[PDB]
Symmetry: C3
Subunit: 212 residues, 3 copies
């Protein structure tokens, strides 16, 4: 049971987080074996798919050490089920204060999404310094981030949205940016076709470009 | 009186809503005749004009089945006056929780405006799933809307701001987009000169473009 | 002591506000000197720098008629210290309702930052009509401002963020724009190397481009 800051530091070593949507929860086992084999033992499983909770539970049992996030959490029921399924922390696209307060009252780490100054100031008012920046590219990309970093100099940021091979290095060049999220290397059609080699290829490719 | 969901379904058949600002309230009659004749029996009368409430009243008396929205509603006094004037629903540029609650406590349909994830979360927390997206082009346009529809896949959106003949079809191609608001076919200068023929043509032009 | 409205009219005459980040408090005297000789008796001292309070106090004593703003104020302690040090008003990058209400409760003028309709409507609900627009360029610049001035036509705006010589005239051509904030003419390097002449040249350069 990692604290929020230990999770943040573990993400800082990883730098890229796969955002996984599944139609079939059993696909999480060969998928996670492929991610771990290629050096990424972390996954944000989206509640946009109904199979999310069962996948978190199966993965926790098979790989007790895997870093697991429940993503796109919008309701109190999802928080509760994310915690009992075994997730390590929660990720949300926006900041709904009842949802943030609930994770805090359950000692359940949460990285909420912000994209402007009002949202950042609500987060800082609730004791939160590590946030998701979403949607990254449509909200102004690297230019908006650098601008928000003038007055909010100690924010720890985790961007998601419109991030690919062509711009991941631009985001990772910024010291306050902890890690980026994306799904091009774990695309839904590749998971559905069980093409584990293509997935492992794309994983190695993003890992290489980052360490360039 | 129509419920909120019935109004959303009517707007979905119309697809384009005229946003009207006028100096002389009496012009709403020839203007609505011109809209009705050419296939568009709907109007959003903005409270940016002082002639707004008299125009809504006059129109409700002359054409009892016309769909009428009161736009730019920022105060409780305007909410109350829009209701007694006879408007079917309220439209707002942003989301003030006190104005939304009053409309819901008065059984008066309201489509408030948002442009980022924080504002969408508050709308969903207050039981609202049909929102105005404003200002649409300056907030990032179609690309910002598609990015928002990843996590909030059930929102029903009505874009306003920067919409014209050249981009109305790019917005209407997205399924969750109900209808768009626009003022170029009801330009103030044409209303000031009572140029009802040019208004009729512009309305027919957008209607045909959309059907294409 | 000036009221909030009196400060706004005072900024409407200056048109440009130096945003200063000092490492050494004593540098404020030679800086205030250069600025005051070249036509701008006004500064926004950031609490981003540890010696901000001493700088304001020193500057107030030496030139009691200078217009001083405490900027980047995020906590109640900062509000209380900015007032006892002698600042005329507070500038914030976003809008934290607890901070604004405390300034109003101490009769201390504040211009809070906004960049989207929801933040504007919270301001208006709090009786505020003069706001900082930040970060200006990254939020859509001149195009965002003009789209927001449609429904919020009485707003009084002060943009900051990406404002340079190449675009200050585009913002000042909008009547609701009171004055812009910038730091290129009082840049870090120039202060530390005590380049009072290079700074004085840039101040005249921007005042001239504005009045052209």
């Amino acid at each position: 049971s990692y604290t929020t800051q230990q999770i943040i530091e573990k993400l800082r070593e990883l730098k890229i987080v796969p955002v996984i949507a599944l139609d079939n929860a059993d696909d999480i086992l060969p998928l996670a074996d492929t991610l771990a084999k290629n050096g990424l033992s972390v996954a944000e499983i989206t509640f946009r798919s109904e199979a999310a909770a069962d996948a978190i539970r199966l993965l926790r049992a098979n790989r007790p050490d895997f870093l697991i996030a429940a993503g796109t959490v919008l309701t109190a029921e999802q928080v509760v089920l994310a915690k009992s399924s075994g997730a390590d922390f929660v990720v949300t696209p926006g900041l709904n204060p009842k949802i943030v307060k609930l994770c805090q009252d359950l000692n359940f780490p949460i990285t909420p999404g912000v994209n402007n100054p009002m949202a950042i100031e609500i987060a800082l008012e609730m004791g939160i310094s590590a946030v998701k920046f979403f949607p990254a590219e449509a909200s102004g990309g690297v230019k908006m981030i650098k601008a928000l970093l003038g007055p909010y100099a100690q924010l720890q940021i985790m961007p998601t949205g419109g991030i690919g091979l062509h711009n991941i290095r631009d985001y990772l060049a910024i010291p306050n940016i902890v890690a980026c999220g994306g799904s091009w290397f774990v695309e839904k059609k590749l998971i559905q076709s069980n093409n584990w080699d293509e997935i492992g290829r794309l994983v190695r490719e993003v890992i290489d470009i980052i360490k360039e």
